Structures are given as C-alpha cells and as structure tokens.
Amino acid sequence: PSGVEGAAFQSRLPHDRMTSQEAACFPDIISGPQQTQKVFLFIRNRTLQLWLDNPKIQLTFEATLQQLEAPYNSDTVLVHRVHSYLERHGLINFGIYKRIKPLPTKKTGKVIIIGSGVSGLAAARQLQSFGMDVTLLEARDRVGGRVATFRKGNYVADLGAMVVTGLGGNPMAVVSKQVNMELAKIKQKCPLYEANGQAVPKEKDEMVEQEFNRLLEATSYLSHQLDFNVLNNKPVSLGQALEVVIQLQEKHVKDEQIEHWKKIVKTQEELKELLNKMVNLKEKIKELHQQYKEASEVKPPRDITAEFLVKSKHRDLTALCKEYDELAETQGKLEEKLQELEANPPSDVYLSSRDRQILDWHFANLEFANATPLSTLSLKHWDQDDDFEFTGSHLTVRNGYSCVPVALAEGLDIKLNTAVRQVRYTASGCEVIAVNTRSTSQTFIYKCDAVLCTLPLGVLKQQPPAVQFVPPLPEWKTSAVQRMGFGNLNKVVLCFDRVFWDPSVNLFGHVGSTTASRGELFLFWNLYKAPILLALVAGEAAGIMENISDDVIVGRCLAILKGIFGSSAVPQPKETVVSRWRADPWARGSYSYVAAGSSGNDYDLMAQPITPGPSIPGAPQPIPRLFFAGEHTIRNYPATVHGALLSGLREAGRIADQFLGAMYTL
Amino acid sequence: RKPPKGMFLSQEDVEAVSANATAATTVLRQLDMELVSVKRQIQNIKQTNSALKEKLDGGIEPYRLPEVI
C-alpha cells in the first residue's frame, strides 16, 4: 500500500471509510453527501502522509494547507478541523520531533501521571504539547518500566520488551525514525535439539509443526462449530480444548486399529467356513471314490444297472471334484486378501513419546508468546487480536529497547524513586500520596486536576492492594481487573567471552523431557553485537523458576548448551542476569492475556475513566478525574510496546478534550 | 464448517471424552481391551484354520478320474 492509501494503512485506518471516532468528531460529514466524505478522507489521508513522510518535524496546520492542492486547499476550516483532530488524537505530531511552534509559556491544567513506562511517557509528551502541566511519578530508579535493558561494558540485553513485530501500521515505525533505533531482522530458522543434545531431523520438525497448527485449527472448530465453550459451569481454556482434540485423535487411531483387525477376523472367519466345506467335501469325494472303485470290481459283461452304477458314480465324482476346485479357487483369493491386510496395518500411535516432546516445544512457544500456560487462556478469545497484526519482518532492537523510553523522557518532569501509595479523586480535583522508595517515611502530596494511572495490571491485582484508591474503584472496574489475565515469562542473559554457537542462527530450541517442564529454557537467542545468549523461561516454568537461585538456573543453561555444542566448547559466562517479573513489585508479571472467563470487552472496561460523585448533595455531575492507560487497556494491541504507546496517546487526547476543550468537534 | 483433513471430532465423541475427569482414560482403555479381545480371536481362528488346512494336505489328487472323451 502506497501514496495516500499507504498513509491510512500505516496509521491503522481504513482509507476509503470514516471511523467511529471520526464520526463522533465529524457528525456533519459522516451524515452528509458521499462526495464530502471523500473530500474529508483525502484531507485526512494526505495530512497523515505529510507527517509520515517526515516525522522528525512538527506538522503544522499552515504547513499542511500549503502542501495541499486545489480544490482541497480551498476549504480551510475543514482542513484545520482535520488537522486538529489528528493532532489531538496523536495520529500526527506524536513522539519526539523538532517543535516549530513553541510551547505555550503559561500552562493550562495539572495532570499527575502514575508510572513512566511507554504508556505514561507517550501521554506526557502529548499533554505537554497540548499545553498542560505534567508530572510523572515513577517508583523505580529509571524510566521505561517493562522496557528494561541490561547494559554492562559492551553487553546489551533486553530483560523486557525485545521484539518489534513488523513495521507495517506499527507506530513504532515512526518512533524508530525519531528515537535512535538500530533495528535488525530476526531470521526465522530455528533448529531444535532434543534433551540428549542431538538435532531434530527436518522431516520430524515439519511434520510436528504441521500437526501443531492442525491442532490449533481443531480447537477453533471445537469452539465455533461444536460450541464447546463451557464445561461444568467453567469457561473452557485453550489447554483443555487441545487435550480433548489430542484425546480424540488417540481415540481415532484405536478406532481404525479395531476396524482393521475386525476385517481380518471377518475374512479369517469366511476362510473357516470355506475350509469346513472343503473338508466335508473331501470326505464325500473320498467316499464316492471308494464306491466307484467297488462298482468297477463288477467286471463285464455286466447288466445295465451295474454299468449304470459305474457311470453314475463317475459323474457324481467329477461334479464334486469340480465343486472342490471352485472352493480351492476361493481359498486362494481369501488367503491373499489376508496377506494384504496383514501387510497394510493402520497407524500404531497418534504421537510417539518423541513426537509429543517436540509438540510440547511448540506449546511452550505459544505459552511464551502469550506469557501464560495454555490452561489459562480463553478458548473463545485467546487470539481476539490476531486480525490486527502488523506486516513485515519481526525485528529486535540491537542497541537495547531502553533507547526509546530514555528518549521519550527528554524534557519531562519525572520523579524517580517515588512510589504512589494512594490516589484520591473528588469533584474538585485529585490528590496523590507517594513515598520515597529509599526511606518510606518521607511522604509527598501531589494535587492535580486529573490522574492518569498506568500501573500494570499485575499491580492493580495486588491483594491486599499496593495502591489504594479513595473512593474505592467501582465493581465494574475491579471485576474487569479480577477477570483479566496477567502472565509471566523470564529471560536468562548469558554473557560469554567467545562465540561457540552458530553465528548465522538467530535462535535455537531445547526440547524438554516432560510436558511439565516444556517451558524451562526451551529457547535461546543469539542477538547482539557482543557474544550473548538469551534463554527463555515460559509457561508453568516461569513461576516456578523464580524460586530458584541464579546459579542453579545458569547451571541448567550451561548443561543444556554443553549437551548441544560439546562440553569443552562452552565456557563459564562472564556475566549473567536472570529476570523475575512476577516478584517485581512494580510489575507483578510480564503482560496481560485473555484469560478463560474474560474477553476483549474487559480491555475496554480497563480503559474507561472514573467520575467521582459530587461533594455536595444535589450538585451537578462532575468531570471525569481518574484515567487509565497501559497495555492492559487497549483491546486491539494488548501486551505490547506499541499498545502501551497507543494507550497513552489515547488518554492524552481524552484528557485534553475534557480539560482544554475541543474546537474541531463543532 | 469442517475439521482439518484427517482430524476427527464429533459432538458425540467430545461429550464422551469430557463427561468426567477420567472419561478419556476410560474410553481409551475400553478400546485397548477391545483390541486385545479381537487379536486373541484372530490367533484362535488362525490356529483352527491351520488344522483344517492340514486335513486337506494332498488335495483331491488321488481321487481324480481320467476323462471319458
């Protein structure tokens, strides 16, 4: 997709149609003649094109109007409306760019942002741009949140976000042209090595992967066609569905074995009946011959009855011998029909032990992608966001992802080592209570017009709470929080002084011995300038490994590698880092997932701002005061950096609309 | 509309395998047993047929008569 249509696609918009959001701001246009809608769409797509063509500088209304040609550049109000609309919603002029129009010297409104991860940072830049007073309170001694990079000497390794999943329609594409980012393609070749250390032949690998895909396809059929979505009042999980599908395939293998052996008995039985006939017929023949022989003893000349006897017995004997030859013909047919079936047995098993282990590697891989065991994913909605995937190859940030948040932090007022303890929101404003993480007694009070909460879902779930809301959040919100899933996945960074692995291979797998341990160090990444190997801990293993010391974890890693590349080839690591996202009090997990019993609607609920009740009985309905951003608040792109990046842009626009007013909606 | 080719999943079978916590194990064992039951049934008949064949040893050769052309 290129030209103005490419711009829409790159902004996640339909090029030939107005969105629901656009309808809300341009009700006059969407309800009017088709021609006007087409004019609007062109202005919108073109404005997006100008921004995308050069995201390093602020795209102003004046600049836009000048670059438009007749007759589009004639309706100046419509152009200005579209421009302000895009700007306000963060579709243009987001991230880090050179500002043309200086920031208003005197600011309007005060906003406190809890958390300085990508969602918080993106919202802050926007709000600052719109002219608001913004302060971010961050518990950690750094910015970035779940975007955390290990840096020591020349060693660089991401402990959090690491992959950019295609630049097509990805807002990170714009960020990568602004933020210094060294993107490198991830080669998809990934050999797997069984526990014994020997590689998996191409044939197996492909067959098992095809089956893995077939099984996923099968659970989808089980969900949409057999409506197997509730079992014993409980929502069915992906794991359960897969177990059922596999059991059914095992059943089919046995059903076929049975029908095969039943064809053998049926034939084997027909043979018995034929043989019985033959044995009885041979007796009759044996007897007739004896009679014929006796009749032939009456030598001629003999009367006609004696002659008749000889001739008669002869005929009866020949007739019976003909019957025997016919049955012998049938015997040869049945006998061979048996050597045929005996030689063509159906399959012995659905999946051998080896096949199951390799299959478990694929499941571990899926457990890694969703940062959760398959038994916790909603069968109905686990892949609710698949239709929104970006295009292009997956990439990694060669210089460490942290370069993004660090850059987004430029010029912002950030209070590090400040842990928010309480959020108070009332009809006339909010007050956030925070402590200094280095000496908890030291307390801070921040008064503001609005609060943007970007605390991770893991933190929001903490019981008893880590952050208290006063008044408490309503049940519609807390229930969404309880329902949503909050996963976990960990990484083990191994820094070596030499390269003992295949340098042309970006990643390789380790196939576990049992299903229980499938996610334990199942995948290794070779990705940076330095000789570094990154090991992944997924699924059920993630949670358990957190209770294991670094040395024992690293020991296991080395053991695996020695098994693959040879004992003498693998040296002791010079530096090792092990992440523990679940234990991290500022994260309490890695990222959200659609839990069984949940749905994409919960992400919408997480996103709805809270409006306090009036302070005075009978006083009019207040303004919303408490807002939410963060990956767990964006239905189409949850659990990602771009998702967090977008959620911040969204809330900044909503806050600004609420407190600064909208001049583009009229 | 359909399962992947070669994959088998009927409403009837799903219900059977998910009727209880160990319904699957029961279904699969009852099939393992039907299998053994059919295999021994085969060896049995094979043994009987082998004996019947031993009785037809020599066929009907010594009992055939020349043709009166």
Swiss-Prot record, chain A:
What GO terms in the biological process aspect are recorded for it? cellular response to cAMP; cellular response to gamma radiation; cellular response to UV; cerebral cortex development; DNA repair-dependent chromatin remodeling; epigenetic regulation of gene expression; guanine metabolic process; muscle cell development
What residue stretches are annotated with the SWIRM domain?
4-103
Q: Does the keyword Repressor apply?
A: yes
EC number(s) reported in the record: 1.14.99.66
Keywords tagged on the record = Acetylation, Chromatin regulator, Chromosome, Coiled coil, Cushing syndrome, Developmental protein, Disease variant, FAD, Flavoprotein, Isopeptide bond, Nucleus, Oxidoreductase, Phosphoprotein, Repressor, Transcription, Transcription regulation, Ubl conjugation
Description of post-translational modifications: Acetylated by KAT8 in epithelial but not in mesenchymal cells, thereby regulating the epithelial-to-mesenchymal transition. Acetylation by KAT8 reduces KDM1A association with nucleosomes, thereby decreasing histone H3 demethylation, leading to transcription activatio of target genes. Polyubiquitinated by JADE2; which leads to its proteasomal degradation. Deubiquitinated by USP38; preventing it from degradation by the 26S proteasome.
Major localisation: nucleus
**Quaternary data:** Component of a histone demethylase complex with RCOR1. Component of a RCOR/GFI/KDM1A/HDAC complex. Interacts directly with GFI1 and GFI1B. Interacts with INSM1 (via N-terminus). Component of a BHC histone deacetylase complex that contains HDAC1, HDAC2, HMG20B, KDM1A, RCOR1 and PHF21A. The BHC complex may also contain ZMYM2, ZNF217, ZMYM3, GSE1 and GTF2I. In the complex, RCOR1/CoREST strongly enhances the demethylase activity and protects it from the proteasome while PHF21A/BHC80 inhibits the demethylase activity. Interacts with the androgen receptor (AR).
Which disease relates to this protein according to its record?
Answer: Cleft palate, psychomotor retardation, and distinctive facial features: A syndrome characterized by cleft palate, developmental delay, psychomotor retardation, and facial dysmorphic features including a prominent forehead, slightly arched eyebrows, elongated palpebral fissures, a wide nasal bridge, thin lips, and widely spaced teeth. Cleft palate is a congenital fissure of the soft and/or hard palate, due to faulty fusion.
Report the protein's function: Histone demethylase that can demethylate both 'Lys-4' (H3K4me) and 'Lys-9' (H3K9me) of histone H3, thereby acting as a coactivator or a corepressor, depending on the context. Acts by oxidizing the substrate by FAD to generate the corresponding imine that is subsequently hydrolyzed. Acts as a corepressor by mediating demethylation of H3K4me, a specific tag for epigenetic transcriptional activation. Demethylates both mono- (H3K4me1) and di-methylated (H3K4me2) H3K4me. May play a role in the repression of neuronal genes.
From Swiss-Prot, chain B:
* Whole sequence portion shown: 311 to 379 of 485
Query: Its biological function?
Result: Essential component of the BHC complex, a corepressor complex that represses transcription of neuron-specific genes in non-neuronal cells. The BHC complex is recruited at RE1/NRSE sites by REST and acts by deacetylating and demethylating specific sites on histones, thereby acting as a chromatin modifier. In the BHC complex, it serves as a molecular beacon for the recruitment of molecular machinery, including MeCP2 and SUV39H1, that imposes silencing across a chromosomal interval.
- Protein family: Belongs to the CoREST family.
Query: What PTM annotation applies here?
Result: Phosphorylated by HSV-1 protein kinases in case of infection.
Q: Where is this region: Interaction with KDM1A?
A: 1-69
**What is the superkingdom listed in this entry's lineage?**
Eukaryota
The major lineage groups are: Eukaryota, Metazoa, Chordata, Craniata, Vertebrata
Q: Which residues form a coiled coil?
A: 24-59
Q: Which gene does this sequence derive from?
A: RCOR1
**Protein name in UniProt:** REST corepressor 1
State the domain notes. Answer: The SANT domains may bridge the nucleosomal substrates and the demethylase KDM1A.
Query: Where, subcellularly, is it found?
Result: Nucleus
Q: In which tissues is it expressed?
A: Ubiquitously expressed.
The subunit field of the Swiss-Prot or TrEMBL record says:
Interacts directly with GFI1 and GFI1B in a RCOR/GFI/KDM1A/HDAC complex. Interacts with INMS1. Component of a BHC histone deacetylase complex that contains HDAC1, HDAC2, HMG20B/BRAF35, KDM1A, RCOR1/CoREST and PHF21A/BHC80. The BHC complex may also contain ZMYM2, ZNF217, ZMYM3, GSE1 and GTF2I. Interacts with REST. Interacts with the SMARCE1/BAF57, suggesting that the BHC complex may recruit the ATP-dependent chromatin-remodeling SWI-SNF complex. Interacts with SOX2. (Microbial infection) Interacts with herpes virus HSV-1 ICP0 protein; the interaction leads to the disruption of the BHC complex, thereby preventing the BHC complex from repressing transcription of viral genes.
